[model samples]
Target: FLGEEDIPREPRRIVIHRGSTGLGFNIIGGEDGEGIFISFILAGGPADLSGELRKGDQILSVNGVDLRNASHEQAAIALKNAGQTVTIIAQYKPEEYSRFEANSRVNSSGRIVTN
Candidate 1:
């Protein structure tokens, strides 16, 4: 989780899933760093229900460096390495952005069909 004041650009809610290659996470809508933001983790729906990643957990550092000073790509690299939970330091923030969905429709199999 990140605060609205954290991201350099306007922060928005994105979806992420772990594939055979690695974890997939991207920005869908809202603006980067503009409003509040929340994040969760899912592994092909394996980690979706359990909610291993909790809300209000402000990501503080990646590996050992402070995420506040790291670039998005750098943070992504760190996240990708979370094979079995990498080191994460986060603070708690009550206020967060509202959840927004991407321009994708659900199919009969419960999969998202992108625009």
Candidate 2:
């Protein structure tokens, strides 16, 4: 039988090659200095198939750009301009915390866009 999967103690870097839908994920948070977390990972897409990322993972950086204090707009732009291949540093949070869906400019809703 399978046991609980191991969670990384520190941040991890993931290099994803963009598919037809780019990184193929949506994000929330990063408004007013709040944390930025991943959400809505599209199946069969780059991020989904990356085998590292998951929903609720706190994105630490995008293409080496620090996202800890990055605004929603800044994060959005960084991702959009990260070219075909993107590198992300993310931390896995296993503890319970609140999540809000509001004013996340990085959101793509339910639709994916191309470059």
Candidate 3:
């Protein structure tokens, strides 16, 4: 999550939104629907390497390899090895907002209160 002072931009705007799996969905509710992973790089971050990574690049592989059949753990290792120029291979999932809704109160102050 970003602070209010943070604005979406070339590098900072790069982000990934991940959702829970089936079992995790059950605990959170079916409203969770399906899983989602949004991987992106900050403008000046290492992953941002030479503008090679962009806002909507469908990551298909890393280091000349495909993650199609890789387990989540395998994928993690791959990502770790990828380091700064990590290759991301993902099928673009259409961006959509959920019809389900939740209500909450947010503290908008810039101050930090210790417990």
Cα deviation in Å at residue 78, candidate 2? 0.8
TM-score of 2: 0.75
lDDT of 3 by residue, 43-109 (tens): 5444443443332233345556665445555545555555443334434322321111233122233
Per-model CA lDDT versus the true structure: 0.41, 0.70, 0.34
Clashes of each: 9, 0, 10
**lDDT winner among the candidates?**
2
Higher-TM-score candidate of 1 and 2: 2
Give residue 86's lDDT in candidate 1 (0 to 100): 47
Please name the candidate that would achieve the greatest TM-score relative to the true structure. Answer: 2
Instruction: Score every model by TM-score.
Output: 0.40, 0.75, 0.37
- Give Cα distance to truth, residue 19, candidate 3, Å: 30
The better-scoring model by lDDT among 1 and 2 is 2
**Shift in Å, residue 41, candidate 3:** 1.6
Q: Rank the candidates by TM-score, best first.
A: 2, 1, 3
